[PDB]
Write a protein that binds this ligand. Sequence first.
Ligand SMILES: [Cl-]
Lengths: 376, 376, 376, 376, 376
Amino acid sequence: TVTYTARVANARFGGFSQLLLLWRGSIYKLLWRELLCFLGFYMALSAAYRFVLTEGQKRYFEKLVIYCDQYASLIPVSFVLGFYVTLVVNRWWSQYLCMPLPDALMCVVAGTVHGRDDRGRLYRRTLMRYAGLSAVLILRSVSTAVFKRFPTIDHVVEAGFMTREERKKFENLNSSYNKYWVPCVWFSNLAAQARREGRIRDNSALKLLLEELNVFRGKCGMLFHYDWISVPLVYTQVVTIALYSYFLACLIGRQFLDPAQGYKDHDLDLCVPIFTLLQFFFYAGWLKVAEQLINPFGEDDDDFETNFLIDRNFQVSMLAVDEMYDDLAVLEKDLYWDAAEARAPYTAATVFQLRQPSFQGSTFDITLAKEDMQFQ
Amino acid sequence: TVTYTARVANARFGGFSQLLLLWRGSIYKLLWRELLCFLGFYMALSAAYRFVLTEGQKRYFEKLVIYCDQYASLIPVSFVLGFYVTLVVNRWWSQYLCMPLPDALMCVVAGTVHGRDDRGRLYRRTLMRYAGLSAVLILRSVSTAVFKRFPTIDHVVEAGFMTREERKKFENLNSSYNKYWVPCVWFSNLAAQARREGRIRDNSALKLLLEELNVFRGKCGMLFHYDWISVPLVYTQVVTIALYSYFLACLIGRQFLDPAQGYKDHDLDLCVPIFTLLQFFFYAGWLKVAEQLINPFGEDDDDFETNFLIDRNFQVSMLAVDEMYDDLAVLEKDLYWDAAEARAPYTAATVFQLRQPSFQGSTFDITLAKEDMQFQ
Amino acid sequence: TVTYTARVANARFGGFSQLLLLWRGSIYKLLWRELLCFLGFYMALSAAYRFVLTEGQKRYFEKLVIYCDQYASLIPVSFVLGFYVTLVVNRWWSQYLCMPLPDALMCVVAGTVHGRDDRGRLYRRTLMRYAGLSAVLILRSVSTAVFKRFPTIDHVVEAGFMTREERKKFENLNSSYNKYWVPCVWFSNLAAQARREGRIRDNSALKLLLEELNVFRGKCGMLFHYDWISVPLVYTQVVTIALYSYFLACLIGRQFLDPAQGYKDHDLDLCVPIFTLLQFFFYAGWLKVAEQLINPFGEDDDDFETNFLIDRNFQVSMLAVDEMYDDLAVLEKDLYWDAAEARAPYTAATVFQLRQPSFQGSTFDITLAKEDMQFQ
Amino acid sequence: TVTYTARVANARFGGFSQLLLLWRGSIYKLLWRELLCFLGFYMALSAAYRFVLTEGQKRYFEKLVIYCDQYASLIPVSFVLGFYVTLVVNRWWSQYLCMPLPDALMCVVAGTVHGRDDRGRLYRRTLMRYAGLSAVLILRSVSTAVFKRFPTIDHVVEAGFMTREERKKFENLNSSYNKYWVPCVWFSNLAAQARREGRIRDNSALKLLLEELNVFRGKCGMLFHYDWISVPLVYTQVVTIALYSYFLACLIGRQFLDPAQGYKDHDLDLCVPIFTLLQFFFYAGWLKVAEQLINPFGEDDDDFETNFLIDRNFQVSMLAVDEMYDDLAVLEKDLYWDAAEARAPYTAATVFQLRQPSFQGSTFDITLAKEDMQFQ
Amino acid sequence: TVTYTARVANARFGGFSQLLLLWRGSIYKLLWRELLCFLGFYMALSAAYRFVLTEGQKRYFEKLVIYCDQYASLIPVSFVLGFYVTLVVNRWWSQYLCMPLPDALMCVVAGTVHGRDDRGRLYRRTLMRYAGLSAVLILRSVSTAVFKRFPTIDHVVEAGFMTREERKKFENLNSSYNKYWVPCVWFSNLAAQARREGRIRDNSALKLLLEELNVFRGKCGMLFHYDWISVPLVYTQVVTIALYSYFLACLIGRQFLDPAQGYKDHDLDLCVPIFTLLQFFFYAGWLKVAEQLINPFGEDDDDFETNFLIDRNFQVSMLAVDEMYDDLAVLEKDLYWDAAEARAPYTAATVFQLRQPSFQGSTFDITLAKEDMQFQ
Ligand SMILES: [Cl-]
């Protein structure tokens, strides 16, 4: 992920113009190769027309260029790109939202699975580890980066997400389908056991655990679905064909023709199709947006940092359910205990935010007349 | 389903251009027949104009071609295609999301319906089988592929989703409406029985089971609704008529006219309407997107693999609630038990993902001044 | 509702072209009258120009036609139609989703309201009848079809949804507002009574019943809201005015002018504005989409089959909570009891769906190198 | 709110054309003043050109008109209007959905807060009154109509939503922020008290009450958010500037020029810019859609009937929790008790809806062949 | 936030035209600098052409201007702006909706955490303070304004959101990741403790608290996600490049050429590109919409008032759970106790809202015929 939120935090002269100078995750990095290819084909045609063709071949080439220019219709292609890329961007954000995060589970497990002893620690850590393990199994199934981190289940074991006994059980399960869900069933069984032993003190707690389990497992499943059900291939081929047809029409019809021929709209020879090149950059980059986002789980600059998320999730969940279990600071009176109201101070750099009238609602400046406000 | 996620995983020179070479699920496979028909009509008209018509008939044909060219307006047709196809694509994804999946139920059933004995196994397996049976009943009602797998209820019985006693009960139910919901009521009754016998140990557990039951049953119902309430036929006819009218206007107005007549924009005879053909491919393919997706439950390449999902769901649910019931590996200390932090290693092929600064939030490089940070 | 899902199940040569031959629910059925009116006005103007006007009046008419042609701008009108019709279509689908369906309630009631005796039957049937009654009350308030089935509350009583004692209570309730919600309060009171008597065995069950009650009642309320809050009238008038202005501009500016006058783009007299007629069909039909969908509860071909849904819902709910209460087939071992795996067979017509590789995830063909997969 | 659902219930010749004759809530009512202003400016310019300017000033005016006509680009302005107005319309519907309605609470309170005595009545009525009071407080904060009904808290008290003791408590609360939430906290405290006294019989009931409380309170909060966070002012200014720039370009460039000058596309002097006027009506009305909907809580014709909703909600909630508490008709056998099936009759005016085949699913006419249906 | 809801409350002559006069949060404030730069470049080119270039250089400049004018295509750029800005606006609203608000928690805590004593006060205040503290930690991570208010954790402590003992615990937690979630785990542990001591009286109450905790914590997490996952940089660069390319094409191709040269569409020299300037204002402002909204957590006029929300949330939560705990006014009969119906009065300024017929549903004016309403 290429984060540039800090760069667009507060209004700056130029707006996004400053973002135009970024390389990592940039259109330039993604598009320079194709740009040069388009320019090379264009310049090869121009060179042929300028230095190879006979006079008659030149007149015919001019006829072809003029005819082809009529078909460089950016309107429809703009329509299709807009709709298709918007679909892809929305799908990409939804996928990111389907990443399984243990925070909700870790809150519930810290609050409901009890015991300072080793057995209670084992329960809490094992439940969170099962969640992380389901996450790892699915992510290695859908993400190139995570897979290359865990190319085999042996790696998952050596990395500590799965124990050896667990792998024996996992492997003996006779299923030809992806087993990412297996740790979630392990979680359910362990939670039921914890309740039976009384580590979970009430049935409502066990219900809360199972609910959050299924929220987490549902996110894992959603990741599988997004990996499996691509954007319809036919649609992608359609949009690509539209774009490439536009580029063909442009690479022929944007040729600079001899001004001495006096053709309409061919009076200036620039030798370099500057505006055609900018148009190519715009439209090809627009499609590149979809090309980047259609599979966000790779090793690219702006792909999701899935391995980072795995590390963070495991470390934080372990801390939450083990180090922080039943380790509160003593209840003490807060700074505003004796204060009827409460407002933390402001720094000198922020006190200006004050003195802005406190919004109460849009109606509170109407100033109605007396006789009008009398009840019937 | 034609999965091509692996092909668009990491940025590749050309982007989708590589997808243009795919046959299964492709625009080419879906469109070649119509393409050839359009070309045949176009070439028949051209042949008539070139070799049959008298001189006067040729002048009149030229007048008609010029007049018809004015009406080949791809702008509006692009609008309508964009909006309509987007609606269809969104509906298609929503339908896929309404496929009933037992994973949530199987987690709950593994965690809440107890007993290693045969009776407990019977309870768990029967509940999951009822879920799968509702799924089969609805899918055979809405999916051509599943129906051809289960053309009669006898097939459902022989396949083991419904027992003989159950079919007697199912058939005696006097209802003229689709009975896919019947196993969900069976599920509810059986769950209540399991609670009464104490196999379900608490009321909160029975509530969780019934909640997940209704989530699953609601997905089944949603499938029925999507099958029943088509995209409004009037809308589909409107978009089709717009497209075909464009194709008529093009098949006449894109004829190559005799350059010797010196008509404006008719100076080059290519004999093959290359750009018109590409435009036809683009627009007809764009509509084909909707045509493919409007009913995703058939036997086409990119239709949902419903029978595969049935197999997977049944096998996995059975495993989860029967083989994996109360079969945990012993609680054991994990690899990171004694480690204050925790981070699994990286493979040599992935360690580069490290050393990327750990994102903490966009504000954490601001570097405010000392006097500014003093509280008021 | 005009269901055509079966027609677009599997890819067919022509795609939607086959749908163009449908009459029920079709654009033709909805639009022929207006089409003929447009053609009649057009032909009346043409007849006047051809056979009534003096020479000078003809020159002036030609000037007017040429001027009016400049204003037949289908671009903006396409924009507004796209956005407005899309809003209407989405609203229409949301409305359909707000139809109250008893299936969830019937599952809960079958599972939670107990007793094979007459009193238990009375409880279950009465709860489901109250749900159906709320549905009937709201549907008769928002649907012309349902209202004409139940033009008075007396009809509701004679149809059995409301008893005589209930109507006395219903009518004595002093409320000037729509009383569709009254049976939902009756439901809540009866459920509380059932719990008090122990017919509902636990508080979590009563909570589940009340939750599903409010889901159902919320759907009823949503139907009321959709009936009350139209699409803003101003918006509808705006889109209609845009469309009609286009049609005026076309009915004047698409007149065939005398070719002997030699006006630009007026060289061919077809006597019939074929492409103008197709354009009218397209655009007027596009708006007709909204016109049909804006109120989906009437007696039209593609309106929702609300009366059918009432019949189905009542019959199915009654069956579920009465005939099927506590009437399970004996628990018996399933066909796959002794099978470690499980897969139902395939018919000869479907076995081809097999042998397609079982999708495990997009990463599982990467084939990493040995030294790359070593952990750091 | 201007309800016109009944007018568009069933297909009618002309479709929306009949809606064009409506005045209340209409584009005409909202736009006539601006229309006349545009026409007045246009006619003032035309009068100057026709009767004031010298010959040279006329040639220069003609040059200006021709130049200005090039910039009347309705395409982009159509784009921006489409996107912006769609955003506003969606926001408007979401706001309406955030109106707090007591129906869910009243169902729960009727079902869970017990006692026919005066104390039980006090509990139920007071809880519902607290909900209504929160609704009133927020609505008077966000709605001009409601505020003018309750310009001061004294009005709220005299209207009975807040008692005198409650106002003392409400006013003594030292908070500079809007206090609409205070009755929701009162509700929570009272509910906890009711449970403590046993008026609420179980903890699951109290939980249901608090859940529905927070749903209601969340809707109130959402109303505050929509009131506070306008559509970004910059966006609104952008769209307005685009529209007005188009109107400037049109008011100059749509001037009728002297045909004797023989300028291209200026050959007919109509003296009245009919199509320009229709275009103004269309585009200005399109923006008026947003202008009407951007704040739906005023006293306009099509603003939400917030005061009506207050009246209805209070009356209905009071009836539901007080008059209808524990006042069921005796459980009695329904009309279909002895009937295996069940279907209410149809009126002569609706029986035609019958005989339409009962939809069972799209697959149930496939008619597979015998040998194909054999299992492998 | 620049609230202008009160200005667009009721229809006003001109509609948004009055908003065009606003400075704070306005397009003018955001765009004047760029506007002047565009005008300066344009005027520098014009000055060069008018006063520096030789005659031949002038003919060549004219050729360049004419060629460049062909490429000022506002159509596609309008498409891309529409789609991209709409995505940004929707994301902005979603972000605002992810702001963590304690109101739901404070309702639950006031209702479920009991005791008038100091210990009960400590429990309630500490739980709400933990929620506020998580909110502060995340907001200082994602918001420039909040960060500059709390540049260091020491500020958080001195402001009273975190105690000294809590900071010791917070700092000793060995985690390299953002710790905003830590107070939510503290909350869970404290809630479990409160239940264990009986301050929380039932398990369903503790479950409700933990559910609302995770709703709140999920909002905090969502804020982190929105801060981290920018709108894809490639997309932003694409849209910016499209816009700037249009501005380049305009700054050259909108030059006023010498009318004495008699070029087509260059007959009037205005010296100031009025319409080009308006177009620049429109399009650049349209992009500015996204530029403003892409990061809404800064110190700009229309950024979210995050510090205000912190103050309000803390003060209100403290009041709700401490001052207002178990402090109800005595249950008393309401004004409408003895009234069968109930309707609060109207002010003279609002009674007109009455006499509008009370909407009962769209069907209730149909007036069916007698023989038609007979049941079959
Ligand atoms: Cl619960």
